[PDB]
From a paper:
[name] has two biochemical activities, a protein–protein interaction with RhlR, which increases RhlR transcriptional activity at target promoters, and an esterase activity. Curiously, RhlR function additionally depends on the metallo-β-hydrolase enzyme [name], encoded as the final gene in the pqsABCDE biosynthetic operon. With respect to RhlR, [name] is required to form a protein–protein interaction that enhances the affinity of RhlR for target promoters. The effects of the [name] E182W and [name] NI substitutions on pyocyanin production are not through impairment of [name] catalytic function, as the catalytically inactive variant, [name](D73A), remains fully capable of interacting with RhlR and driving pyocyanin production. These results indicate that [name] has two independent functions, catalysis and interaction with RhlR, and it is interaction with RhlR, not catalysis, that is required for virulence. Moreover, the RhlR–[name] interaction is essential for [name] virulence phenotypes, and therefore, of interest as a focus for antibiotic development.
However, if the morpholine ring is removed and either a phenyl (BB583) or tert-butyl (BB584) group is installed, a modest increase in binding affinity is achieved (EC50 = 71 and 34 nM, respectively). Within that context, BB584 displayed the tightest binding to [name] and provides a starting scaffold for the design of new derivatives. We determined the crystal structure of BB584 bound to [name], which showed a similar orientation in the active site and similar ligand–protein interactions to those observed in the crystal structures of [name] with BB391 and BB393 bound in the active site. Specifically, the nitrogen on the indazole ring of BB584 bonds with the Fe2 atom, displacing a water molecule that normally resides at this position. Two additional hydrogen bonds exist between BB584 and [name] sidechains: the BB584 amide oxygen with the hydroxyl group of the S285 sidechain, and the BB584 urea oxygen with the backbone amide N–H of residue Y72. As predicted, the tert-butyl group tucks into the hydrophobic groove that sits between the α-helix consisting of [name] residues S104-L116 and the backbone of the conserved 69HXHXDH74 motif. Analogous to the structures of BB391 and BB393 bound to [name], no significant conformational changes in the protein were induced by binding of BB584 (rmsd of 0.24 Å for 293 Cα atoms), possibly explaining why none of the three compounds disrupt the [name]–RhlR interaction. In the case of the BB584 ligand, an atomic model of the ligand was fit to the difference electron density observed in the active site of [name] and refined with partial occupancy (0.93). Thus, it is not surprising that the compounds do not affect the [name]–RhlR interaction. The crystal structure of the [name]-BB584 complex solved here provides needed information for launching the structure-guided design of the next generation of molecules targeting the [name] active site.
Numbering used by the authors: -1 to 118, 121 to 296
């Protein structure tokens, strides 16, 4: 209900729709009269929901030509095996390390296990992960998606070691995945998601702050941010991460164990993701983040 946060399914801009669940959304870009792209790859159990929404906008799904992926986490690529078979002309665009994850039997195994925990139903017939129609893309690569859509790949490691963002400079629009963290709907601030490397996470935010002023900021969860939330997004995310480090140091300096802020963080932050993230995994991830901050 905040005017700066668009969090409803359907049309978001002249060229853009939100498909599926706002908390794990798939974004639809209209590239031309007969060309479309998807951005973010969701959770597996949403295959039929997202497919249903897609077909309400796109009369012929063979016109879906690209599918852009920020990182390899199970909640950002779980749909790929289940929907790519229904998209004969789609090319999945992911970073090198993200593509490597789909060639790893053990990595794919974790992804499938996490996604099956979210099943209420049984999944569509899936192609193999290693058989996905992928094309690796590089840091700085320009994605000429259509006559009015040129997006630059920008490496944004720290949340995960493969993470990238996509920047539409015509629209000052950044698809930032989880590199800024989890947007707090009740409080209007970023919650950090430092799950791989704090130093890389903070350096990505420094670089993203140097982009031309954002008009639209589109993370991996929660919808589209605009106004000052977009303009100040990368900076605020940086600030909130330092705020979490200071908090961690304060408590450790009082002899607290990492388990204590972990439980408080899980209590205070675990509610937002309970529909796509098992509660033990949220607590575990909070523990892992504090471990990462504590070292670095
Ligand atoms: C990468 C592989 C080896 C291939 C295994 N694959 C995975 O996907 N592991 C995995 C990924 C993400 C999460 N997430 C979170 O804990 C979390 C917590 C709060 C908000 C948000 C918003 N997004 N995520 C979160 C947990 C485990
Ligand atoms: Fe993630
Ligand atoms: Fe995520």
């Amino acid at each position: 209900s905040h005017m700066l946060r668009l969090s409803a399914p359907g049309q978001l801009d002249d060229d853009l729709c939100l498909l599926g669940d706002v908390q794990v959304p798939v974004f639809l870009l209209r590239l031309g009269e007969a060309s479309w792209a998807l951005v973010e790859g969701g959770i597996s159990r949403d295959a039929e929901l997202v497919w249903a929404d897609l077909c309400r906008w796109v009369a012929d799904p063979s016109q879906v030509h690209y599918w852009l992926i920020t990182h390899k986490h199970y909640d950002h690529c779980g749909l790929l095996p289940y929907l790519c078979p229904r998209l004969p002309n789609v090319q999945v665009l992911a970073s090198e390390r993200t593509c490597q994850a789909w060639k790893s039997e053990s990595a794919v195994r974790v992804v499938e296990r996490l996604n099956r925990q979210l099943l209420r139903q049984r999944l569509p017939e899936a192609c193999a992960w290693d058989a996905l129609p992928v094309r690796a893309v590089a840091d700085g690569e320009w994605l000429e998606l259509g006559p009015r859509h040129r997006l630059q790949v920008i490496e944004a490691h720290g949340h995960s070691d493969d993470h990238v963002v996509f920047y539409d400079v015509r629209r000052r629009r950044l698809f930032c995945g989880d590199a800024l963290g989890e947007f707090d709907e009740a409080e209007g601030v970023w919650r950090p998601l430092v799950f791989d490397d704090m130093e890389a996470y903070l350096e990505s935010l420094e670089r993203l702050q140097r982009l031309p002023t954002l008009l639209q900021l589109i993370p991996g969860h929660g919808g589209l941010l605009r106004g000052r939330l977009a303009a100040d997004g990368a900076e605020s995310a940086y600030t909130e991460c330092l705020r979490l480090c200071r908090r961690l140091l304060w408590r450790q300096s009082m002899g607290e164990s990492l388990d204590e802020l972990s439980e408080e963080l899980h209590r205070a932050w675990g509610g937002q993701s309970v529909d796509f993230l098992p509660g033990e995994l949220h607590l575990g991830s909070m523990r892992r983040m504090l471990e990462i901050l504590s070292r670095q």
